[PDB]
C-alpha cells in the first residue's frame, strides 16, 4: 500500500502530492522550462485560409509544457472574452484536458453536468493546470484513465478497456485520455430536478477503427461538420492533435513502445528509481529516452529526426498551398453564381482533403511517431485538394474566370485578412477579459481554496499576442 | 592465398569455380529458383501510357533470379529481333550488367571498343549470366568492382572509390555495378588503327550528387533526354532501378547494413561458415536475413513490410494515373492545334513528375530499402503531374475542349492501343530471331567453348510473350 491509501485531501492540487512523492513532483514542475510560444499561423499562414470560419483561424500555437496548459486554455483567442459564466464563445468541454479539476468536477457533478454550459462556467472551479490526479489514483498511485470517453473509444474501436489493458498498454492510455482526436456531441438531457439541459460532450470518432479514412467515414456517416467555412462554405472536420491513433499504427507504437518509454524515461539516482515526471522533448536526454535501445550514434538519430521533419514539411506546405487555393476559388465561383449542385463534388474533394492534411499535421509528432502514414495522409489530401481544383478550373470557366489567380496568403497578416479575422478587435476583447474575470477567477480560486498562489509563478509571460519576454 | 593464386582458366563461366568454391557455386546456382515472371505492364498498364514511344511500353517485367539474367536480356521485346551483329534497336551497353563475358571483353578490347556497336554484336560472345567474375578477383577471391563507371560515378558524387571504401561498403558496391541508375552518353573516339567509332557508354548520373533531384538537375543541365514521349511529345527522362541510390539514404543504409547482409546473409553448416550466394527474397528465410538484429515476431516484421508496400502502391498509382491523363490531355491539346510555346511549362511537370515517380518505383525494393523518401518522391511526383494538368485545362479549353476526358488505360491492351504499339508484329519478329540468330548464337557459344549447355537448364521457359510453364 502506499502512505495516502485512504485519500489525498485536496488531489486536484498537484502540491498536495509532493509530500509523498519529491521525485515525481519536481520533475513534474520542470515542463515550466518548455514556455515557448510558437506561433504556427505565423509559421504556417496557410493554415488560416484553411481554418476560416472557425477559432483557429484567430489563434494556433504549438504545444509547450503541461506547465502551461490551464494558461494557455485561459489566453487563446479561441476561448474568446466571457464576462460572465453564461457567455464566451466556446463550452465547458473545453477544459476537460487541461486540468485535475476536471475529474474532481465530474466525479462529483456526473459526467453531463460537467459538459453542460460555457467554458466560463468554471472559471473560479477548474484552475490547476494538468496533474497527478488527472493520472493517477489518490489512494493507490496506479495508473488511472478519468475520462469516460476514453474507454467509450477503446470499445468502440474493438480495443479493451483501461482497466483489461497491460500495464505497458496503460503507459500510452494516460496520455490518450487527452492526446486524440475528438469532436462535441450534442446531447440532449434531464437532471435530477427534471431540467431539461444540452450538454456538449467530448467524443472519440472511434466506432469505425482509428484510421483517419474510418474517421472520414465515422464523421460523413452521420452527416457532421465542425463548421461552415468562412470562404468556401465546404462543410468541414477539424482534426485535433490525434497523438495517440497516429502513434499506435507507427512502428515504435506496433512494436508495443510505450509514450511513457520516450516521453517518461525511467531514471536512476544513487539507488533511487522512478519515472522522469518532465514531460517534453526525448531528444534532450537521448540517453535516457532512446538510447537504451538504440545502439548507434545520438548525433546520427537527431540527424534522421529532422529528415523526417524536413519530408512532412515538404509535403504540408503543398497540401495546404492546394488546400488553400481550392477555397479561395471555390469562393471566388460562389461570387460569380456557381450553385450549390456545381459545387457539391468540388466541396467533397476539399472536406476530405483537408481532413486527412490535418489529421496528419495535427498531432506535432507525429512526423516522427509514424512517419510514412503522415507522408502518405498529406499525399492524398494533396490528391483530393488537386481534384478539387481541377474541377475548380471548368467551373471558373464556366463563369468567365478561367484565368482567375487565387489570392497570396503567405503571411498571417494577409491570410487572416482574407479569413475576415479582426485580429485588433478580438485581443482587444481579450486583454479586457484577462484584466477582469481572469483575474477575479484566480481571486476567488485562491481565496476558496482551489488554487496555489505557487503554481502561477511565471505562468502567464507569453501568448501568440504578448510576450513579457519569457513564462 | 587461395588454391588458384595464379588465376583460372575460363573464369567468365562460373561453373570454373565450383572445384574451389562448392558451398558458394551450389547456393549461387539456386537463384534458378527464382523463375517468376511478373508482367509490369500487365499489372500496372499506367506504365504503357507513360512510357509511350519508349521500348519500355513494349516489354517491362519485374526482376527475377539472377540466373535468368542473360536469358531476359535476350528474350525481352526491348532488344527486338536483330538478324545480324549490325541490327536490331539497342547498343551493345545492354549486356554491361548480364553476364562475367563482359568484364572479359572489357579486359580485353577494352571499354570504348566494348561500348561501341550493336547489341547483337556479342551475341556469340556474351552468353553467361551474372557469375562469380561479376564480383570476385580470381587469384584473390576478394571483392571488385569490374565496371569502370562505378568508380566515376562514386568520385563524381564524393564518394569513395571502392577500392578506398571498407569492406562493409564493398559488400553493397559490388552489387551497385549493375542496381544503379544510368543513362548512355554518346561518345566519339578513335581506335588504334584510326578509325572514328561512336560508343554508347554507360554513365551514373551522380556528378550533383545520388538523390532524386540532384540527378534531375544533372539530366536538365545538359538537357537531356531518353526519348520524346509519343503521346505529349514531352522530353522525357527513363529511370532505371536505382536501387543502390535509393538505399543509400534509407535507414537501413545510413545504418551501414549492407545488400549482402540481408540478401546473401551468412550461413553455418556443422563448423562450415559462408555467405549464401542464392540472392532473392530476404524474408524467405528471416532467421538468416533479418532476426540477427530485430528480437520481434518474424510474421510482424513481414506485416510491416506488406503494409509499407501497400502505402507504396496506393501513391503510385494516383501518380502515375494523373501522369498518364497528362500525357493524353497534351496529346488532346497537340491534335487541337496547341503550339510547343503553349506547351512547354506543362511538358517541364510532365518530364519532372515522372522522372521523380519512375526513380520511386524503378528500384523494385525501394519500397523497403527507403520508404518514406519513395513516398515522398511519389507525392512530389504527382503534384506536378497536377500542376501540368490544372495547366492543360485552360489549354484544353482555349482549344474548345474543356470537357476532354482523358481515355482509360486500365488493361495492358489499352494502353499499348493508346502508345501505338504493334505487339503482334514484335513478338512475331522476336520468335523468329530467337528460333534463328540466337540459336545461332548459342551453338556458337557451345562449339567454341565459351558457353556450357547445362548453364541453359530451363533458362528459357518463360518471358512475358510465352510460358512452356516454368522456367
Ligand atoms: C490531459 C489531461 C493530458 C494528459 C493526460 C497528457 N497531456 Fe500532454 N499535453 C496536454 C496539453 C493540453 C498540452 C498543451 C500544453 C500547452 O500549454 O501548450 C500537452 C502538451 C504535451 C507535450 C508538449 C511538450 C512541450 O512542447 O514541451 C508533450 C510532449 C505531451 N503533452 C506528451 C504527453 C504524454 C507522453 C502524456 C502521457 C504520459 C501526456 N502528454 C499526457 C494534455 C495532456
Ligand atoms: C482532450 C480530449 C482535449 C480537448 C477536449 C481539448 N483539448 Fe486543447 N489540447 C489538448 C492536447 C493534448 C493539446 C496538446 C497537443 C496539441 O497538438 O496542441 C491541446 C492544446 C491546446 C492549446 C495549446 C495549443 C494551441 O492550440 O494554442 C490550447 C490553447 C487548447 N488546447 C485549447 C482548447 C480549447 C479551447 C478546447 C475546446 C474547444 C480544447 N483545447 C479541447 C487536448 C484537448
Ligand atoms: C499522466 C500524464 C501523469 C501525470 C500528470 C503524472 N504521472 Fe506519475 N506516472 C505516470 C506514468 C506513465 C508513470 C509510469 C508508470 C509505470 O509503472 O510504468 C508514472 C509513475 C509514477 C509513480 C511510480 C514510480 C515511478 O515510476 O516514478 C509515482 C509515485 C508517480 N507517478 C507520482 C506522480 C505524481 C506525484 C504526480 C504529480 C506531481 C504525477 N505522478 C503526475 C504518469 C503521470
Ligand atoms: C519514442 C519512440 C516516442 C514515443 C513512443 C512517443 N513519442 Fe512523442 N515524440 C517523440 C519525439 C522524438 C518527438 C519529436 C520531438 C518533440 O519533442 O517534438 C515527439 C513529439 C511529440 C509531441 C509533439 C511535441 C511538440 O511538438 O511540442 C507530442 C505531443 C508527443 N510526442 C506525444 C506523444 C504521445 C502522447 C505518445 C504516445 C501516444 C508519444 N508521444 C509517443 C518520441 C516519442
Ligand atoms: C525501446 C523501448 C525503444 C525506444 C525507447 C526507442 N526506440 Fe526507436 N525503435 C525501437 C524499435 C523496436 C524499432 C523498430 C525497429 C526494430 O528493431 O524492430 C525502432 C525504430 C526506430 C527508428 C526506425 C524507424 C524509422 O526511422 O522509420 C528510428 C529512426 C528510431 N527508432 C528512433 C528513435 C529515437 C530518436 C528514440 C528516442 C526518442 C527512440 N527511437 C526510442 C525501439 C525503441
Ligand atoms: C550485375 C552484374 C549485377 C550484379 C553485380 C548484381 N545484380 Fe542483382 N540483378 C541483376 C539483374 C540483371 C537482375 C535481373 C534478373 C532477371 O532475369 O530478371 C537482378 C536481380 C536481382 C534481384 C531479384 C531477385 C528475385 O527476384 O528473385 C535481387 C534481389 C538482386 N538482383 C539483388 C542483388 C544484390 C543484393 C547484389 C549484390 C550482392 C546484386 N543483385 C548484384 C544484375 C546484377
Ligand atoms: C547496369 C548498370 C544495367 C544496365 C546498363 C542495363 N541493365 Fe538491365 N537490369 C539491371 C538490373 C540491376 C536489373 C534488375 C532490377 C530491375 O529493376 O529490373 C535489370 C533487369 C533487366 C531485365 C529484366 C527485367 C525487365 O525489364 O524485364 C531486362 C530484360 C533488362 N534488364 C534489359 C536490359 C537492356 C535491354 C538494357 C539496355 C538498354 C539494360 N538492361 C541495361 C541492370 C542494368
Ligand atoms: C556479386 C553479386 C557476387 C557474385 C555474383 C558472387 N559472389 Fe561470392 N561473395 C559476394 C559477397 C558480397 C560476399 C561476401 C564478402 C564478405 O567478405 O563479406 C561473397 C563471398 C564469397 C566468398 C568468401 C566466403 C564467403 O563469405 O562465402 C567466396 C569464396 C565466394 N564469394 C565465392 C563465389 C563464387 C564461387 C561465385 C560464383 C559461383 C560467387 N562468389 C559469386 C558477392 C558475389
Ligand atoms: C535488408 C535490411 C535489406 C537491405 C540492406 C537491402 N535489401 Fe533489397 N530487399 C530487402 C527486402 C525485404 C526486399 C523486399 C522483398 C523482395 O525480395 O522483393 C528487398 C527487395 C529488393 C529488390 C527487389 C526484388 C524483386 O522485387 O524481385 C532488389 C532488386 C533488391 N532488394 C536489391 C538490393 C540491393 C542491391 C541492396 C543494396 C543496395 C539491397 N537490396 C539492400 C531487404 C534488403
Ligand atoms: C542488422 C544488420 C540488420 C538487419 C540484417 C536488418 N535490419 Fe532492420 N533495422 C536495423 C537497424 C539498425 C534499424 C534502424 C533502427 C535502429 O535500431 O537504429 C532497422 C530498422 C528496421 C525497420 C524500421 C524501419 C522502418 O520500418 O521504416 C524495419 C521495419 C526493419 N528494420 C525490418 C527489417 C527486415 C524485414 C529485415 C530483413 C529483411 C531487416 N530489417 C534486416 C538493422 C538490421
Ligand atoms: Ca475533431
Ligand atoms: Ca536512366
Ligand atoms: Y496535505
Ligand atoms: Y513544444
Ligand atoms: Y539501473
Ligand atoms: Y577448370
Ligand atoms: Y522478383
Ligand atoms: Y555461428
Ligand atoms: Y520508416
Redesign the interface.
Same mark, same amino acid.
Given at each position: 500500500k502506499t502512505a495516502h491509501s485512504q485519500g489525498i485531501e485536496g488531489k486536484a492540487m498537484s502540491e498536495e502530492w509532493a509530500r509523498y512523492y519529491p521525485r515525481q513532483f519536481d520533475s513534474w514542475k520542470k515542463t515550466k522550462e518548455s514556455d515557448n510560444i510558437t506561433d504556427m499561423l505565423k509559421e504556417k499562414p496557410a493554415l488560416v485560409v484553411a481554418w476560416a470560419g472557425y477559432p483557429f483561424s484567430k489563434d494556433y500555437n504549438a504545444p509547450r509544457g503541461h506547465y502551461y496548459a490551464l494558461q494557455d486554455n485561459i489566453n487563446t483567442l479561441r476561448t474568446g472574452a466571457p464576462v460572465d459564466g453564461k457567455t464566451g464563445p466556446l463550452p465547458s468541454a473545453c477544459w476537460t484536458c487541461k486540468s485535475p479539476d476536471v475529474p474532481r468536477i465530474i466525479e462529483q457533478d456526473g459526467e453531463l453536468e460537467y459538459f453542460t454550459g460555457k467554458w466560463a462556467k468554471y472559471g473560479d472551479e477548474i484552475v490547476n493546470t494538468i496533474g497527478c490526479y488527472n493520472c493517477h489514483d489518490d489512494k493507490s498511485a496506479e495508473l488511472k484513465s478519468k475520462v469516460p470517453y476514453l474507454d467509450r473509444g477503446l470499445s468502440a474501436a474493438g480495443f479493451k478497456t483501461f482497466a483489461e489493458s497491460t500495464h505497458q498498454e496503460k503507459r500510452s492510455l494516460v496520455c490518450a485520455q487527452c492526446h486524440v482526436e475528438y469532436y462535441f456531441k450534442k446531447t440532449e438531457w434531464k437532471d435530477d430536478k427534471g431540467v431539461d439541459k444540452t450538454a456538449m460532450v467530448v467524443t472519440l470518432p472511434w466506432s469505425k477503427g482509428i484510421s483517419t479514412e474510418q474517421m472520414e467515414a465515422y464523421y460523413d456517416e452521420i452527416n457532421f461538420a465542425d463548421w461552415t467555412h468562412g470562404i468556401s462554405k465546404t462543410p468541414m472536420l477539424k482534426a485535433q492533435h490525434p497523438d495517440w491513433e497516429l502513434y499506435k499504427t507507427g !512502428?515504435h507504437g506496433? $512494436?508495443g513502445v510505450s509514450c511513457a518509454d520516450c516521453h517518461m524515461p525511467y531514471t536512476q539516482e544513487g539507488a533511487v528509481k522512478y519515472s522522469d515526471h518532465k514531460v517534453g522533448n526525448p531528444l534532450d536526454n537521448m540517453d535516457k529516452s532512446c538510447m537504451n535501445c538504440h545502439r548507434?550514434s545520438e548525433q $546520427?538519430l537527431k540527424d !534522421?529526426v529532422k529528415q %523526417?521533419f524536413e /519530408?512532412k514539411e515538404?509535403?504540408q506546405d #503543398?497540401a495546404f498551398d492546394?488546400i488553400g487555393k481550392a477555397h479561395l476559388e471555390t469562393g471566388k465561383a460562389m461570387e460569380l453564381g456557381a450553385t450549390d449542385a456545381e459545387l457539391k463534388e468540388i466541396r467533397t474533394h476539399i472536406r476530405h482533403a483537408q481532413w486527412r492534411a490535418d489529421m496528419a499535421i495535427a498531432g506535432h509528432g507525429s512526423f516522427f511517431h509514424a512517419?510514412? +502514414?503522415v507522408? /502518405?495522409l498529406?499525399?492524398?489530401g494533396? +490528391?483530393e485538394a488537386?481534384k478539387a481544383? !481541377?474541377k475548380l478550373? %471548368?467551373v471558373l470557366?464556366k463563369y468567365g474566370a #478561367?484565368?482567375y489567380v487565387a489570392p497570396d496568403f503567405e503571411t498571417k497578416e494577409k491570410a487572416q485578412k482574407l479569413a475576415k479575422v479582426d485580429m485588433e478587435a478580438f485581443i482587444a476583447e481579450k486583454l479586457k477579459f484577462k484584466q477582469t474575470l481572469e483575474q477575479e477567477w484566480k481571486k476567488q480560486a485562491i481565496a476558496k481554496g482551489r488554487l496555489n498562489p505557487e503554481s502561477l509563478k511565471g505562468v502567464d509571460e507569453k501568448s501568440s499576442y504578448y510576450d513579457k519576454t519569457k513564462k
Amino acid at each position: 500500500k502506499t502512505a495516502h491509501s485512504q485519500g489525498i485531501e485536496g488531489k486536484a492540487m498537484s502540491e498536495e502530492w509532493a509530500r509523498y512523492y519529491p521525485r515525481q513532483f519536481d520533475s513534474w514542475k520542470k515542463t515550466k522550462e518548455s514556455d515557448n510560444i510558437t506561433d504556427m499561423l505565423k509559421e504556417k499562414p496557410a493554415l488560416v485560409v484553411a481554418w476560416a470560419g472557425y477559432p483557429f483561424s484567430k489563434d494556433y500555437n504549438a504545444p509547450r509544457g503541461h506547465y502551461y496548459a490551464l494558461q494557455d486554455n485561459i489566453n487563446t483567442l479561441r476561448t474568446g472574452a466571457p464576462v460572465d459564466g453564461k457567455t464566451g464563445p466556446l463550452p465547458s468541454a473545453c477544459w476537460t484536458c487541461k486540468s485535475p479539476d476536471v475529474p474532481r468536477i465530474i466525479e462529483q457533478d456526473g459526467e453531463l453536468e460537467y459538459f453542460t454550459g460555457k467554458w466560463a462556467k468554471y472559471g473560479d472551479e477548474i484552475v490547476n493546470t494538468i496533474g497527478c490526479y488527472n493520472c493517477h489514483d489518490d489512494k493507490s498511485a496506479e495508473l488511472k484513465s478519468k475520462v469516460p470517453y476514453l474507454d467509450r473509444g477503446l470499445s468502440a474501436a474493438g480495443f479493451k478497456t483501461f482497466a483489461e489493458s497491460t500495464h505497458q498498454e496503460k503507459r500510452s492510455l494516460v496520455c490518450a485520455q487527452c492526446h486524440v482526436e475528438y469532436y462535441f456531441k450534442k446531447t440532449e438531457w434531464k437532471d435530477d430536478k427534471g431540467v431539461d439541459k444540452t450538454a456538449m460532450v467530448v467524443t472519440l470518432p472511434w466506432s469505425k477503427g482509428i484510421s483517419t479514412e474510418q474517421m472520414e467515414a465515422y464523421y460523413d456517416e452521420i452527416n457532421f461538420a465542425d463548421w461552415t467555412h468562412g470562404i468556401s462554405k465546404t462543410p468541414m472536420l477539424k482534426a485535433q492533435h490525434p497523438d495517440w491513433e497516429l502513434y499506435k499504427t507507427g !512502428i515504435h507504437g506496433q $512494436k508495443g513502445v510505450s509514450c511513457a518509454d520516450c516521453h517518461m524515461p525511467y531514471t536512476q539516482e544513487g539507488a533511487v528509481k522512478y519515472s522522469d515526471h518532465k514531460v517534453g522533448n526525448p531528444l534532450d536526454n537521448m540517453d535516457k529516452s532512446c538510447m537504451n535501445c538504440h545502439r548507434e550514434s545520438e548525433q $546520427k538519430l537527431k540527424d !534522421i529526426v529532422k529528415q %523526417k521533419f524536413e /519530408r512532412k514539411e515538404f509535403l504540408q506546405d #503543398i497540401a495546404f498551398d492546394n488546400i488553400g487555393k481550392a477555397h479561395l476559388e471555390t469562393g471566388k465561383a460562389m461570387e460569380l453564381g456557381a450553385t450549390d449542385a456545381e459545387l457539391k463534388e468540388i466541396r467533397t474533394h476539399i472536406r476530405h482533403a483537408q481532413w486527412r492534411a490535418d489529421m496528419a499535421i495535427a498531432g506535432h509528432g507525429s512526423f516522427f511517431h509514424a512517419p510514412e +502514414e503522415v507522408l /502518405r495522409l498529406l499525399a492524398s489530401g494533396n +490528391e483530393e485538394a488537386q481534384k478539387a481544383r !481541377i474541377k475548380l478550373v %471548368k467551373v471558373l470557366a464556366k463563369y468567365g474566370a #478561367i484565368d482567375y489567380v487565387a489570392p497570396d496568403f503567405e503571411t498571417k497578416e494577409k491570410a487572416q485578412k482574407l479569413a475576415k479575422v479582426d485580429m485588433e478587435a478580438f485581443i482587444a476583447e481579450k486583454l479586457k477579459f484577462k484584466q477582469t474575470l481572469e483575474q477575479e477567477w484566480k481571486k476567488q480560486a485562491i481565496a476558496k481554496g482551489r488554487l496555489n498562489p505557487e503554481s502561477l509563478k511565471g505562468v502567464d509571460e507569453k501568448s501568440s499576442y504578448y510576450d513579457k519576454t519569457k513564462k
